[PDB]
Structures are given as C-alpha cells and as structure tokens.
Design an enzyme around this catalytic site. Structure first.
Site, PDB file in Angstrom:
ATOM      1  N   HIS D 113       0.860  -1.171   0.000  1.00  0.00           N
ATOM      2  CA  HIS D 113       0.000   0.000   0.000  1.00  0.00           C
ATOM      3  C   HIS D 113       0.903   1.230   0.000  1.00  0.00           C
ATOM      4  O   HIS D 113       2.029   1.185   0.505  1.00  0.00           O
ATOM      5  CB  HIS D 113      -0.947   0.008   1.203  1.00  0.00           C
ATOM      6  CG  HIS D 113      -2.133  -0.893   1.045  1.00  0.00           C
ATOM      7  ND1 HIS D 113      -2.990  -0.814  -0.033  1.00  0.00           N
ATOM      8  CD2 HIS D 113      -2.614  -1.883   1.834  1.00  0.00           C
ATOM      9  CE1 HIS D 113      -3.940  -1.723   0.093  1.00  0.00           C
ATOM     10  NE2 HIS D 113      -3.736  -2.383   1.219  1.00  0.00           N
ATOM     11  N   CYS D 161       0.273   2.875  -4.579  1.00  0.00           N
ATOM     12  CA  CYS D 161      -0.365   4.168  -4.828  1.00  0.00           C
ATOM     13  C   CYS D 161       0.572   5.277  -4.372  1.00  0.00           C
ATOM     14  O   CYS D 161       1.446   5.058  -3.530  1.00  0.00           O
ATOM     15  CB  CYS D 161      -1.700   4.289  -4.090  1.00  0.00           C
ATOM     16  SG  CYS D 161      -3.013   3.246  -4.748  1.00  0.00           S
TER      17      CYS D 161
END
Lengths: 173, 88, 88, 173
Positions: D113, D161
């Site tokens: 993440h 991301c």
C-alpha cells in the site's frame, strides 16, 4: 554552414529522418508542419538576488540556451530575476498561451540558486525562504492546467544546486 | 462526448545534479551542465531522441574532478521517443 | 591512492503511477503494473535496454480506462544502456 | 522452449548481442561471466497489514517477479510483511551482501500500500504512520552505503499508490 536558422545544431537529413522512422514504428512523438507550427519555449533565469551572491556567468547560459532553442525551432520568452510567486504567475501565463494549440512540444528552462527544497526566487534568504518547487512546475503544465499540451513532450531543464553536499565519496584503487 | 486523459503524461525533467548535491557554474564560461547540454544537443539532436541525449550528457560527467556533479533525469512520463528532427 | 566517485550514479526507479495518483491491483490477476512489466521484460529484454522497456510499459498504459494509471521513471542516473542479454 | 532457466523470457541470440554491441560503442553496462557471477535481487512485498485492507493478489505479483528475476539470472531474496524499520534493516543487510562484489547489477522490488509520502509498512495507520521513503532506498544503495554496487545498474521497481487521486481529467472530442 552556421548562417542558417539552425545555427550550430547539426541537421537531420532526409535519409537520417527516414531511418529514424523505420527503426521505430509508432513510438515517436509526431512533429507538426514547419510552415504552420508555433513552438514556444520559456527561460526563467535569476542572476541578481537580494540576499544571496550574484550568479556571474548567467548571461552566457541565457545566450546559449536561447539560441539553441531558437535553432531547434522554438520561439523563446526570457524572464529574469523573479520571486517564486512571479515564477508561478509566469508559468501560469505560459500555460495559457494560444500558440501551444498549434505546437507539438515545449521546453521550460529554469536557472537559479537552489536548495534541497527547490529553486530560489530573487528574495530568498535562510530566514524567509522564497522557493519554487519542481512539483509546482509539473502541476502547472499538466493536462488539467495546460490542456493545449496534452500528448505533447514537455521538457523541463533545471540548473541549480539541490543541497550543500559535494556529491562525492572516496575509494581506494 | 467526454473522454478520460491522464492528468500527467509526456513529461521529462533534467536536473543539473543529484538530490542533496551541488551544481557548478563558471563565472565567465557559465554553468557546466548548461554548456554541456548545448554541446550534446547541437551534436546529437539530429540522430538521438531526448532521453538518449540526456544519458550522453550524464556519461560526460562520469569521471569526477574537483568540481563534480551528476545530472539526473526526473519524473519521466514520455510514452514515445522525442526526436527534434533539426532542419524539419 | 584515493579517488573521488559520484555518491549517486547508475540508478533507475520505475513507479506504478504518477505522483498523487492511485495504482491498481486485481484480486486474482495481481497488480496491473507488475503484470505489464513482466510481459514487456519477457518480450523485450532480448532486444531493448531497460530504459526503452520501461518506456514501452508506459506506452501500454496510454489509453485510460476505468482504472487508469501512468507508470513513471524516476531519479535516473544511468550513464550507459542497461541490456539484460537474456541467455548470457 | 520454456523448460530452461530463462523460462518465458525470450533469448538474446549471438547475432542479436553483437548487433547491440555494434549499434552502440562504449555506452553499454558490462556484464560479468555467466559461469562466475553472483547476481542478487530483493523483493519486499507487504500483503497482511494491521490496520489497512489485505492486498489480495500479491502472491501472484511475488510469483511473477521472483520467476522473472530468476529467469534474468538473479538470485532472489523474498521478504514479506515488514515495518518501515524492518525494510530499512533488510535493505541495509542487502547492501552488505558479499555477492554484489562479484555481480554486475541488482534489482530491488517493493510492493505495498502507498501514500503521497511513500511506501506503507505492516503497522501503518493514518494516526501512526509507518512509511519508507523512496529517498531512503536510494541512500541505502548508493556508492557510500553500498560501495560494492559502484558503477553497476541498480533498478528499483515500486508497486504502490502515490496518493488518493484517480490520475485522470476529462476532455471533449
């Protein structure tokens, strides 16, 4: 001969151009017709500052880059001794220029004193920083803020320090 | 009708040094990175795309002297080769 | 004797998206950037240097769909072309 | 055939290799002898987190990247579910490996993440961030902190991301 518009830039011949278009298929940025295109380039150079030393030799940089970009077919706007706010305003104006619509590309050149955080404006001091960040340059020229340069190469050139370090380490042979 | 486009694409940045590090400027000859870039653009614009030219500029700095620096290409979203086709 | 060397050189980074932006991952198929990179490396390692391969990966993402992203090459100090010469 | 060590990676033939060495003079990174070289690669992948959703499909990424890097001649170390501190320790250990001395290159793969600031560790939350910055990766692998990889290509691959935005803008045709 260096008497032409391209000056000291070596020419790409017709055979060289076709070899370039043959070696690679559909992986080259398209160039617009030379007769009708309106290429723009921007140079922002800071030489005289309020609190930090004069960037002697900057005029040589301005001359060299201006002539080179002209040689490459770009109409060059030269802006000198700006604050970070002035640079932002100038970059916003540049992104709004009608010529980009009939252009295939752009060059942005920034030349100044620099620190870790970014590019120094004319009023910069350690007490009161005056900094333009690289991230802001990209943001102002992206598809949202400059739709006229969508799908077109945007080349950003930055002359500036990025910190105090000499950028070297020792080793023994 | 409306269509989606990438917010950030077709960029290339070329900085005079690596992060944290100094870039050099001669008082009469000008900035070394700028002078070196012009020389390479004049020589190689006809035959090489911009990414290739910038790499050649980086190579020219490879052997460090008393005033060392290593130009860096940053935040690249060029999806194609950018040839200047000088003369065209 | 001692000699100077650049502190930072011969790096290339390849990120799954542009700054501020999301990268996509399929629950069974995996990350789209990862899958796309493997495919391009398998196909083009034999004929293209890494910078060229990464550019091809970027091109494959050019047409945005419902799950758009644009991989970005960052902080490049490669002074030469890096060919993998698979099989050698 | 995909039964060999290179698997599904298309081979560079002898004629292809010599064409590569002829098209470009002294502008290619040298490769060490296949019989004696000790290439290393590192994959750090975070799937199970304390406070943030499970990265389903990460095992597919691990498998694909591990096999690819092996196909390319690298011995692959795979590390899973690490804090930013654990990642730093692991990167420091990797830079200290004796094999880099007899290697010509390295690959580092990070999959997790991600937020604007960088790559999330296993313990990451909005209240108490657990982030590895890209700048730290470079610093730990540079000529100072990893002299064994001096003059050798260091390829960093990051799946994550970089913020919350969809990365798109609308336009009309």
């Amino acid at each position: 001969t260096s008497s032409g518009s391209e000056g000291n830039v070596k020419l790409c011949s017709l055979e060289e151009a076709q070899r370039i278009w043959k070696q690679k298929s559909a992986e080259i940025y398209p160039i617009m017709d030379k007769s009708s295109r309106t290429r723009l380039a921007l140079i922002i150079c800071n030489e005289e500052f309020d609190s930090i030393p004069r960037r002697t030799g900057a005029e040589v940089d301005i001359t060299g880059m201006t002539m080179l970009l002209q040689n490459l077919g770009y109409s060059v706007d030269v802006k000198k001794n700006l604050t970070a706010s002035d640079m932002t305003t100038e970059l916003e104006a540049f992104a709004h220029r009608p010529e980009h619509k009939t252009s295939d590309s752009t060059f942005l050149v920034f030349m100044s004193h620099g620190i870790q955080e970014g590019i120094c404006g004319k009023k910069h001091s350690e007490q009161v920083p005056d900094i333009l960040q690289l991230n802001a340059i990209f943001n102002m020229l992206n598809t949202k803020n400059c739709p006229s340069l969508k799908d077109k190469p945007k080349v950003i050139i930055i002359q500036a320090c990025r910190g105090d370090s000499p950028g070297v380490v020792w080793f023994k042979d | 009708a409306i269509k989606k486009a990438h917010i950030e694409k077709d960029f290339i940045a070329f900085c005079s040094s690596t992060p944290d590090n100094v870039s050099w400027r001669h008082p009469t000859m000008g900035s070394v990175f700028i002078g070196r870039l012009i020389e390479h653009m004049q020589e190689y614009a006809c035959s090489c795309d911009v990414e290739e030219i910038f790499r050649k500029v980086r190579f020219s700095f490879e052997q460090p002297d008393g005033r060392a620096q290593m130009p860096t290409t940053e935040r690249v979203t060029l999806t194609r080769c950018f040839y200047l086709f000088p003369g065209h």
